[PDB]
Curated annotation (Swiss-Prot), chain B:
Coiled coil: none annotated. Mitochondrial membrane ATP synthase (F(1)F(0) ATP synthase or Complex V) produces ATP from ADP in the presence of a proton gradient across the membrane which is generated by electron transport complexes of the respiratory chain. F-type ATPases consist of two structural domains, F(1) - containing the extramembraneous catalytic core and F(0) - containing the membrane proton channel, linked together by a central stalk and a peripheral stalk. During catalysis, ATP synthesis in the catalytic domain of F(1) is coupled via a rotary mechanism of the central stalk subunits to proton translocation. Its main location: mitochondrion. This is ATP synthase subunit f, mitochondrial. It comes from Saccharomyces cerevisiae (strain ATCC 204508 / S288c) (Baker's yeast). The keyword Transport applies. The chain holds residues 7 to 91 of 101 of the full protein. Present with 14600 molecules/cell in log phase SD medium. F-type ATPases have 2 components, CF(1) - the catalytic core - and CF(0) - the membrane proton channel. In yeast, the dimeric form of ATP synthase consists of 17 polypeptides: alpha, beta, gamma, delta, epsilon, 4 (B), 5 (OSCP), 6 (A), 8, 9 (C), d, E (Tim11), f, g, h, i/j and k.
Length: 52, 85
């Protein structure tokens, strides 16, 4: 088949993506999640102070 | 001669403090919020909510559904060319 060569290249592309991008995108996502949580916990602290 | 007393005649400024605004807010903000809940809805059964739980949660950013959907389309169009067009 002609198009089976194209499917081999597509498999190589998805392999490169799972190699490089899926850990990078994990790290990117992680960084942001932390930031949201940290803001949240900061506000929690903030109001506890005010009561005291 | 004038024995006037400011401290106990301050009693209308003792509602006046600014964190009172925050206080009455956050007794209402915390009148019903679960502390963290028990185990709310992270997993559910819609029979594709299970699919979501393994792949499309914050628990997993795994590339597997993408792979699955890609492989589906590869299977789809080759048979379908001869059936439609």
């Amino acid at each position: 088949n002609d198009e089976s060569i194209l499917l081999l290249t597509f498999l190589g592309f998805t392999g490169l993506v799972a190699k490089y991008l899926a850990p990078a995108y994990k790290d990117f996502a992680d960084a942001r999640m932390k930031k949201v949580s940290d803001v949240l916990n900061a506000s929690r602290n903030k109001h506890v102070e005010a009561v005291k | 001669v004038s024995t006037l007393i400011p401290p106990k005649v301050v009693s209308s400024k003792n509602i006046g403090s600014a964190p009172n605004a925050k206080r009455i807010a956050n007794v209402v903000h915390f009148y019903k919020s679960l502390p963290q809940g028990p185990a709310p809805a992270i997993k559910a059964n819609t029979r594709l909510a299970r699919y979501k739980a393994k792949y499309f949660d914050g628990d997993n950013a795994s590339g597997k559904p993408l792979w699955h959907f890609a492989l589906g389309i590869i299977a789809f169009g080759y048979s379908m060319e001869y059936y439609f067009h």
